[PDB]
Amino acid sequence: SLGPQVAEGENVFGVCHIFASFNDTFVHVTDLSGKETICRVTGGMKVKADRDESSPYAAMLAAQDVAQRCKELGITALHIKLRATGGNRTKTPGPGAQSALRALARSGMKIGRIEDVTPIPSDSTRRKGGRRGRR
RNA sequence: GUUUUCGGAACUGAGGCCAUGAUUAAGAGGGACGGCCGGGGGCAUUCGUAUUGCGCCGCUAGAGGUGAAAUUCUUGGACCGG
């Protein structure tokens, strides 16, 4: 759990793919290449009920865990790349993604880039649902 | 008997003369011609993420889904990331 860079010299970069659906939120801290992930905590693994898994409360400690999980490695600065469900389905991020990065910015994680990596299509297939829709 | 002037019909030649014979170009149409215009058509071609699937790589206990749940997938490594 040792980083070769000195702490007061600069800040080591990381990246967390904040993915929030409308039933769960994923906080996935990976490396910059994205090929060597560090840890990935969800929103339903911190609440013992399917109700509050997309809730702001289940994601405001899910950053209090994954930041603690990455303080000892030498990492203090991250990128955040928002991504909703996307595809043919909805594109607005889940409600806890607001409270997700607000939790860790107060939990002690420095902030670098903020961007959107939603899977917006050129043109998807026929979206799930009847022609009359979810009536 | 006959041919005629004589009256009719019929054919043809040289003609003469006519004020010698054709309204207009529909704020109707057709066709041309011109520069263009357009998600008109047909054939061919080229692209785009997404979805899904498969292989590898990562790290994992849940993931999906729901007003709420469960059916379902999941240490046989799903989900999530490359």
Residue A62 (CA) to nucleotide B12 (C1'), in angstroms, measures 128
A21 CB contact with strand B at below 7 Å? yes
A55 CB contact with strand B at below 7 Å? no
Query: What nucleotide is nearest A45 when CA is compared to C1'?
Result: B62
Question: In terms of residues, how long is chain A?
Answer: 135
Order of all β-strands in the sheet with A75-82: A39-41, A25-30, A12-20, A75-82, A110-116
A33 CB contact with strand B at below 7 Å? yes
Please give the method by which this entry was determined: cryo-EM
**CA neighbours within 13 Å on the CB side: how many for A19?**
13
- Which of A37, A43, A32 shows the shortest CA–CA distance to A99? A43
Q: Interior CA angle at A80 toward A75 and A82, to 5°?
A: 155
Q: Is the distance from CB of A98 to CB of A56 less than 8 angstroms?
A: yes
